Amino acid sequence: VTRQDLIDFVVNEAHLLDTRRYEEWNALFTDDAFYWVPLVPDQEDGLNHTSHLYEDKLLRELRIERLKSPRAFSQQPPSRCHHLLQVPVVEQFDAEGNRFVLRTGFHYTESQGDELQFYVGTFFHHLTVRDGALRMTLKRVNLLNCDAALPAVQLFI
Amino acid sequence: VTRQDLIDFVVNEAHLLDTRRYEEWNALFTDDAFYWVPLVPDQEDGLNHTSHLYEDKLLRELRIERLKSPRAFSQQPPSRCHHLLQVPVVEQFDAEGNRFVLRTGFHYTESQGDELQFYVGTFFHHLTVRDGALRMTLKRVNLLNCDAALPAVQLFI
Amino acid sequence: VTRQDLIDFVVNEAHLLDTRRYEEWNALFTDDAFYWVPLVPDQEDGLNHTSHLYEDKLLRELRIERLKSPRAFSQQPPSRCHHLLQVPVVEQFDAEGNRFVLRTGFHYTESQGDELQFYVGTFFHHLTVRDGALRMTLKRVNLLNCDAALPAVQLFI
Amino acid sequence: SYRDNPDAIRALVQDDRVHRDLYTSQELFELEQEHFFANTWNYVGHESQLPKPGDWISNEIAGRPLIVARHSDGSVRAMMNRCAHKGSRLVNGPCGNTGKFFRCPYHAWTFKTDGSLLAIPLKTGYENTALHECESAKGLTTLRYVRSHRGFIFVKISDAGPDFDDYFGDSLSSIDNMADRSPEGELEIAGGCLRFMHQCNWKMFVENLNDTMHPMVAHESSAGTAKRMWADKPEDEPKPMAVEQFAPFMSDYKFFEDMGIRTYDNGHSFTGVHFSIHSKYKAIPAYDDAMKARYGEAKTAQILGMARHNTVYYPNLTIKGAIQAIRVVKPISADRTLIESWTFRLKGAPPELLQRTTMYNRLINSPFSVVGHDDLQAYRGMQAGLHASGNEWVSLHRNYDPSELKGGEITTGGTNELPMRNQYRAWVQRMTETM
Amino acid sequence: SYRDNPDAIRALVQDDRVHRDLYTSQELFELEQEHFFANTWNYVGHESQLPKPGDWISNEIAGRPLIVARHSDGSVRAMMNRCAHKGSRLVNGPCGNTGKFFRCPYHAWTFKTDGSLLAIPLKTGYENTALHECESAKGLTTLRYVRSHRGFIFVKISDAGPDFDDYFGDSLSSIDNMADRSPEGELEIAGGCLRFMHQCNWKMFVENLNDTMHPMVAHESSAGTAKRMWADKPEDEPKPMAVEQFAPFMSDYKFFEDMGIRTYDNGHSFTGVHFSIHSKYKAIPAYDDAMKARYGEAKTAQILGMARHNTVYYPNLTIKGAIQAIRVVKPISADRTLIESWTFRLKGAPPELLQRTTMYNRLINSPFSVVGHDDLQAYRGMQAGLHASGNEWVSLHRNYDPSELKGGEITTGGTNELPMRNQYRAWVQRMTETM
Amino acid sequence: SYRDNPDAIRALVQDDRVHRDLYTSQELFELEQEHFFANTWNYVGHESQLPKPGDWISNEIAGRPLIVARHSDGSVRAMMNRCAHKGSRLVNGPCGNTGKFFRCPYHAWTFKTDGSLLAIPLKTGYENTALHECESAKGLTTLRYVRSHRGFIFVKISDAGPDFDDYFGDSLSSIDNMADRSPEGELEIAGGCLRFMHQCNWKMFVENLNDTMHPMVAHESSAGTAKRMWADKPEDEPKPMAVEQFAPFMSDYKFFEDMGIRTYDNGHSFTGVHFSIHSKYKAIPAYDDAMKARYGEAKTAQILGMARHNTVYYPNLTIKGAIQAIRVVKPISADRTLIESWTFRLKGAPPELLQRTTMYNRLINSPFSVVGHDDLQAYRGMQAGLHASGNEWVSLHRNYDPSELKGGEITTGGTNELPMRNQYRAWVQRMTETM
Ligand SMILES: O=C(O)Cc1c[nH]c2ccccc12
Ligand SMILES: O=C(O)Cc1c[nH]c2ccccc12
Ligand SMILES: O=C(O)Cc1c[nH]c2ccccc12
Ligand code: FES
Ligand code: FES
Ligand code: FES
Ligand SMILES: [Fe+3]
Ligand SMILES: [Fe+3]
Ligand SMILES: [Fe+3]
């Protein structure tokens, strides 16, 4: 409804990801929404081209549920993540058309044991209003070094 | 009095730390305030559990005064620090109760000679009003990798 | 005219630098403006002291034009850059005097191939109004480790 | 202390077990880079990556930078990425096109696309010298072991070892199937490349490919989770392709035992001789119609009934038949390896084939993949644990029988540990042949 | 060039001086990891960290990963964190509980808590093989040198060297005092662990423990600052515990000289035989009342009158008596070391004891501590400066006398440099015993 | 395998070509640090950096830390930055002022500014010991090869090799010109220092200095771009100093050939005997007036007409005459080097000279400079490409003639590759002298 509401939505989503509240984070998506991590710059779509992550509801639920398992050997000890965000910028704002697009620079840090890695890039958020609640229809994560060699990334960015 | 005043307070405190104006920075605390760096996540208190830093007025004064000594061998050449902050978020705002709580993501960089290190985490600020001036009653610094192996950290975070 | 315009100007300049729109970025400068990167902390001026970069219009045009050459051997493959900015702070605001000073903390990342480097520091922006458009008269880039040993930096910070 | 010490090289491998130094010793890694990887055929690329004349790609094999280029006559040539003057690289980047000649970016020496010298600027300075007697007069150093099969390019740095035909034997049929699933009989590179850095020796990754005992244990938290998540739904509802590709990992031991394994000489082996984990994968009618129109009923049935699980071309290539995806091993150090996963488009096929291939590639081979996380955790655990003392060996006794020492094409059950033993026999031979 | 060169190992140590290679040479560090740390008793943990059956902790000693676990019979066992199949770790993390058996996360081999083999999945594949003859049939490799004193667990990897009793002699009394300051006579681990990474060899940190000439010079900018800050205050006002713990560092030479030192065999030595820097530390009446009720008058006075400054158990443990804090040395490389500081809770004591212990630990051992900053700066300066040429020795001549070569328990003044000489004599012996 | 192998050291250099191991081998780098840089004179600083008594600077030469200080009598002394007690550094930082004595920050040993011992605290602990017989009694280890020419300070760690006068010969004239361009005949350090890390061996940087073949090829994208950007403007408009300094890089071949080159013994050589790229550089009337007032017409004309391009003092110093800028080479590893660029102020000259010098330094030597980017890319390409097999040599055949083997002062054309050959002959000699 207001721009500040969209900024708060993005900030609160990052905060929810930071405090391991995955069940609440996944509820912000629409049923047919996608969580997309492109593999190449200016990628056209996630259907005919490979990506790092192109998750629908089922795959997101699978990833969230695997973290609670006592046999997730790669998650012993569990990893921790931190998001540092630039202030979101509202690119398009269609109040009548029910389409909002936001661009946000991010620095993401992931640490496990005595190991730490960081990444930088941009979030593109597509938001709509369902029954008076703001909800995502697509979350695209553009990495600066998407096509470079990467180590294992075990948490949601 | 206003939220923007608290945001400006946090930003200006970081700026004061960055410019090496320690005498002005230490004056923002209350006489019984604490500068706390927990050692483990979700630490209960700094009394019955070890911490990286739990400083009252005397210890802060000692640390500030040691920096002016000509025999602080570990500070030759002097170190430099930089703070990069996400916009502060006001969680609790008790105008009548005189108690404010702020949460701020941070990226902190410290460099000496040809060596440089960085850390990420969250600041929790407890603020009150004394004689019309905003003053701190507790500064808690949550590090992402608090329980990991760390090198020497020689300045205020 | 308004502060938020100045914050938007700084943010948009960083965005223009991020998306390789050098021709539009160079048009924001005044004809006699300077792009200054000091070499020592609290450097007095860029005339009688060495600096990393002290570019007028001609040198900026030369650097921008060299990137389009098919024989820029050091730019194969091309490098990519990302800016993460703290919210700008307006120090001096002379509406009648036509001179504005802004201070912004920054984290800058540059990646080429499988190599990546990052720097932190402060931007000082001097802005004025020419024919109703905000334009820069000096862009000073204070690096935290300006006097330390550095590798090659091939893009605009 | 293995240098110039071949018997101590042989002593690290026994009939049914190996030593830990094969996974940790850095001096052994350097000796490999000097000896083993220079004496075997290694995948460097595909012909569809350099279609036009003058097109080139750059690769790195056994510590050597290589240019693989398309000469003006349409052939494929391989040369050292090293100028004849003072050693500077001629081409910077992964791929490109130089037109008619290479030009050094240091002093602008020029060479032909096949590597021969073309011109030296200011030649008047070399009249009374001895440049024309040295090897800098011949131009770039070339490789005369370059071969292509259905577009796949293999090179061999040195002249020691069996030739391409005897090196690969009859395993090439796998590649043929990968190429016979296209109505035009051609493959092209499309969909991008996934690059994954493992903090483990390359050997462990090469072993994980034909290990049927691991998936039900290590991959339980993900494959079992998916199986339980679907188990509930009506048996009539269509299975999402994610669940379709994830479910076979949690099969019982009899399934993998009956899948089968075949091994060739020189460490090449494939899994799934008769029926595999890619056997159901739904069905596409348009693709079947196209293949029927091109080949006929019998040939189409024969081709689509060949569903090998995965094939290993030692020491760096692995491929899948019905998925059209390959993986390449890029050793970096004793405890650092790089894995590259490519995908192919079949010429003339409907887009659903490529969509399925990209889905599988993202799900399995991405650095963000949970299956990759579990396998990498297993590799890291092995690398960390192999430093303990006491028991200093790695067991390869499963389904072992000395009659396998005769070699040749051997077919056996799915849980046999024969491929590892054959791999290490070949590795010992390839090191010791040139010491 | 020290490998298989024991005489050149002995040549780096003289009667009253040492060579610089003991602090810089990486090959010497590797030889130590193979020889020295495998021939001495090392602190791996406390019994209160694994109270219940099946409870385990994981440690890293001399380049070996170890599991220290509580067997079902209540004893403590030590084994290699390395599966018998192919080497993968069994447990990931610092501590945990496995119930009744260990299960490998690669192929689900299973072993008992004492390390013996329990079950191999799909055993039918090993009938006609030779698995049962090798050492993989026994299970995990175990350590039969595990001992406990008042809860402290010590291990020794190899079988060369004196046994626990003769190795430690009468220094164990220090530990006893640390345990006798509790009404229940028991310690537990509480308060967390501080981990500090030093860019210096572990040897310098081990020497700084019994060096009484350093504190008034290196620690001047902080301890002297505190002393001057508390100056001009009324003599009746209570001292903050920070000032109480900081003031003794800036004492005169006579204080430290009279404070005293005792040394044992095998590099074990404690400082402060008569009094110490922990002597005043105010007084708590409730704790004294409890100790009076449990022990009496004479025993309580004797226990609380024992105020050793700090004790060194070579090569990796140091403890404090009246503060209840220990430090462990974890060598990483020639120029990288990790120091871990733990704290104990005395059972049945008021919380003030633990509060004081945690305050001292934060003030002295934290990476944010100024005293640690100064000591680390001294270590880094020594590490950087020991690369200069010319004078290639380090002097240990202070208070040296040849009559100390008879060994045994020796008591002397506080500024003596005897402990370092004894440490290096023991280090030479432990190196050369297994050459 | 070069240690104690002088013949294999000689075998890597031939008359007109060199081996690749001179640029990659790490063991060769360590042997150099032990032998080569200890047997040649190296630039450690200028006298204007330490004008007052007690002023010191700290440097790092051949893996040794050094203190260069001004004694109380006004002379310049050099000592090891290593305390005589246990090796800790005495001074931390790049420069400073110690007053009358050095005081160790570990145990407060004290030494005189010339390095001799002054006082040991609590000396009463050394009466019956052997401290006074060892080398710790003399104090810091000193260097007796310290020499100064027009303020430049050169040191030589060891006693093997020719002395300063015979080592440098007549190349010192270059320095004299750099100092004769000041009305007072004095230089001072001003403007700051630029530090640039190159991921290449130092040898490549040292070779790029006298290579006239490269600038019109590698530096084309920048110098040619500037030339084309200016080409258009009226010939009467003043050229910006950026274009003035950039244009000469894109000259034809005859210009560089006629520019000229002179070489001395021991690898010292300068470029531009007749004219140079700094020849035009506009003109300043006030500076000429002052020089005329100080020297006269003839002497000023002779001094200002001497415009050498750049001079190389082997193995780590290069200078420019008419620009008043120097560069120092700081090797770090086989593939890591640090380059420092300083500027000088001429005493009594107008500020325009220093403004021009700082502009040139920023334009050419900064890590943000495009010319530096191109040169570093060439170095990195050479370092990466010298690992290819086959041709394992680097050609130095350009303008080669055996009559150059007589040595001495040799003058020749600008494109001759003689300086590199002389450099490598001197390098071979300096290695093999101490084998
Ligand atoms: O090809 C794959 O999807 C992964 C994989 C490698 N080795 C395997 C053995 C059994 C089952 C799956 C795999
Ligand atoms: O135990 C301490 O608090 C630190 C310390 C280590 N060595 C010392 C020698 C003398 C005085 C204090 C210490
Ligand atoms: O002196 C300079 O500005 C750079 C430089 C190094 N070597 C050269 C050879 C020819 C021309 C310029 C240079
Ligand atoms: S290195 Fe290629 S032309 Fe000189
Ligand atoms: S490595 Fe443990 S079961 Fe195979
Ligand atoms: S190391 Fe210098 S006084 Fe001891
Ligand atoms: Fe696997
Ligand atoms: Fe100390
Ligand atoms: Fe150059």
Residue numbers in the entry:
A (entry chain A), B (entry chain H), C (entry chain E): 6 to 162
D (entry chain B), E (entry chain G), F (entry chain D): 3 to 282, 283B, 284 to 437
What does the paper say about this structure?
To understand the binding of IAA with IadD, we then determined a 2.6 Å cryo-EM structure of IadD/E complexed with IAA. An overall mushroom-shaped heterohexamer composed of 3 IadE at the “stem” and 3 IadD in the “cap” was resolved. The active site of IadD is located at the interface of IadD subunits, composed of a Rieske [2Fe-2S] cluster from the Rieske domain and a mononuclear iron in the catalytic domain of a neighboring subunit. The [2Fe-2S] is stabilized by contacts with Cys85, His87, Cys106, and His109 and the mononuclear iron coordinates with His216, His221, and Asp377. Adjacent to the mononuclear iron is the IAA-binding pocket lined by polar and hydrophobic residues including Asn210, Leu211, His216, His221, Phe251, His311, Lys322, Arg329, and Tyr362. No profound overall conformational changes were observed for IadD/E after binding of IAA. The side chain of His311 in IadD is relocated to accommodate the binding of IAA. The mononuclear iron and the coordinating residues also move slightly inwards (about 1.6 Å) following the binding of IAA. The resolved IAA-binding pocket of IadD/E is largely superimposed with that of biphenyl in the biphenyl dioxygenase structure, but contains different residues to accommodate the substrate specificity. As anticipated, mutation of residues in the pocket abrogated IAA binding.
IadD interacts with IadE to form a functional Rieske non-heme dioxygenase, which works in concert with a FMN-type reductase encoded by gene iadC to transform IAA into the biologically inactive 2-oxindole-3-acetic acid (oxIAA), representing a new bacterial pathway for IAA inactivation/degradation. The Rieske non-heme iron dioxygenases, typically composed of α and β subunits that are equivalent to IadD and IadE, respectively, share a conserved α3β3 configuration. IadD features a Rieske domain (residues 44–160) and a catalytic domain (residues 1–43 and 161–437). IadE is a single-domain protein, containing a twisted seven-stranded β-sheet and 3 α-helices, which may mainly serve as a scaffold protein contributing to proper assembly of the oligomeric enzyme complex.
